[PDB]
Amino acid sequence: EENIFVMTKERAETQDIRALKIAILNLMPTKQETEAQLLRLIGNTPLQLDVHLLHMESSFYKTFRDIENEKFDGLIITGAPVETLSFEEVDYWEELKRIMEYSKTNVTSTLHICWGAQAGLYHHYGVQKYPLKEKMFGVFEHEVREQHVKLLQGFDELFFAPHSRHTEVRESDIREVKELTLLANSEEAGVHLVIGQEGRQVFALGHSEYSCDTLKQEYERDRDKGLNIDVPKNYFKHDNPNEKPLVRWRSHGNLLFSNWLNYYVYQET
Amino acid sequence: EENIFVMTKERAETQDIRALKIAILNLMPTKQETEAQLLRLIGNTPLQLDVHLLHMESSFYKTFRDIENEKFDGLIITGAPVETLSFEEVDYWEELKRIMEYSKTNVTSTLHICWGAQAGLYHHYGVQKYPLKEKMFGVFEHEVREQHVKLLQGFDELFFAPHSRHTEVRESDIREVKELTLLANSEEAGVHLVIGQEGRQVFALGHSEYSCDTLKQEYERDRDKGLNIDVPKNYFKHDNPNEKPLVRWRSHGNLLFSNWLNYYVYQET
C-alpha cells in the first residue's frame, strides 16, 4: 500500500485548562519540611496550580477567615503532633471543624494526611481513634482493596508506604460506614487509604508524602529525647540506623498525589 | 500583610513541542499483543507521538527500506522467539544489523527489549548471551544501581520486574564495557536495565512491558506443549496457577517508558 498510516497519541491539550486552586493547611510545628514535601508531590501533574498556604489562628499564609467565602478545587490537611489527645482537647479543634464543614461545600476534594485523616474521619463519619501499645513506625507492605478506582490508577497490587503514629483507626469501624470505601490496607499496619463520598474526602493514614530521611530523623529525635523507640521497620538495612534508608514508597507517593490532582481535584464540564 | 502571594506550579507548555517520531520494530509472531502493550506504555507522556510500525522483510507496517533516509526520535526493538540460536543463525540477522547500525546515526534513543536487548548488546558491544539450565521465569526484585539517572527518575530503590528467558547476559560482561552502564539488576534474575552511550541505547532484558496475564499465558502454553516448566516465581499466590496473578511491576513499567520518552526520546535546543 502506497499510503501508510501512523499511530498518533494526541498531546494533552491542558494548555487552556483553568488553573487548579489548591489550599494547604499546615498544622505542623516543623512547618517548612512538610510544606516542601507536599509541594514536590503536587508537581506531579501537567496542570497549573495555584497553591494557597493556610494555618490556624493559634508572608504567604492565610487563615480560614480569608477564604470562607471562596471555593477551592482541592485542599490538603496535614498531620499534627496532637494524636494522644482527645480530638476535642486539641486547642484549635473548633476552628478545624469549621474548615472541615466548609470543605464539604466549598472544596471539590480534600486530602487528609495522618492525624488530619483521623480528625476528618472522626468529625465527618464518627470514626474513633485508639492508642497503640507501641509506635507503628516504618515502611509497610499494603494491598489494593478496590479495582478500577481512579485514585489507585497505576498502583501495583502490592505497594509500600510509611506509617508513623502511636494511634490508629480500625478497619472494622471504617467498614461500617457506607460513605467510606477502603482502598488500601496492610496486614501489619492496618488502614492507609480510604475515600469518602466519591473522593470528596481522601484520607491517607500513613505518610506517603515522607521524603527519604524523615523516619530516620524521627527515630533520632525520639531516641535523643530519651524515649524508648524501636528502629523503623523495613527502613534501615539490617536495622542499622547508620545505613542509608531504603526508599520503597517513592513511586506510590507520586501516584497518589498525581491521581488525586488529576482525577479528583480536576473536574470537567 | 494585605497582598498575599500564591505558589504557582506552572503548567507544562508542551502544546508547541513538535511531535515525537517513534518507530516500533515488532520481531514477534504473536504480533498484536506486544504492539498493544507497547502502545499503552507510550501513552505515559503529555507529548504527542507519531508511531511508525515496522517489521522485517521475512496496512500500517513499513520496512527498514522505507525509513533508511529518515530520522527518528525513538525506536523500540522488541524481543523475539529465537534466543536459543546463535545470533548469526537467526534468519533476519543481517537486516537487523543494518537497522541497528542505522539507529546509531538516525535515532536519538533506541529501546531494546529482551532478545532485542541481547542482540543490541552483542552487535554494538560484543556482549554474548549464555544458556540457562532452567527458564528465568517470574517477577523478580531489582535494585537501582545508579543515582541521578533520568531513566530511573521516580523509581523505588527496590522494584519488581518480570523476566522470561532461557538465556542470559552476565553482569561481569556488561561491567567490562565502558560505554555501558548498569542501571538495575536482581540478585536472583541478574541484569535488567542497562544504558549505552548516554541513552543512545536503552536495554531492558526483563519484560517490564508485560501485562497482567502474560506470564500466565506463557506458562499454560509451555505446559500444554508438554514442556517441563515451573510456575512463574512470585506471580501466583501460593504458586497456584488457578489464582489471579499478582501485579507488582506495573508502576515501574510505566515509569521506564515515561522517562525514556520524556528524557531520552525528547531532546531540547
From Swiss-Prot, chains A, B:
Cellular compartment(s): Cytoplasm
UniProt-recorded name of the protein: Homoserine O-acetyltransferase
Catalytic reactions of this protein: L-homoserine + acetyl-CoA = O-acetyl-L-homoserine + CoA
Signal as UniProt keyword: no
Annotated site, Important for substrate specificity, chain positions: 164
GO cellular component, one term: cytoplasm
Record has Chloroplast as a keyword: no
Species, as recorded: Bacillus cereus (strain ATCC 10987 / NRS 248)
Keywords: Acyltransferase, Amino-acid biosynthesis, Cytoplasm, Methionine biosynthesis, Transferase
CDD domains associated with the record: GATase1_HTS (cd03131)
A molecular function (GO) term: homoserine O-succinyltransferase activity
GO terms for biological process, alphabetical: L-methionine biosynthetic process from homoserine via O-succinyl-L-homoserine and cystathionine
Outcome of substituting residue 114 to A/S: Lack of activity
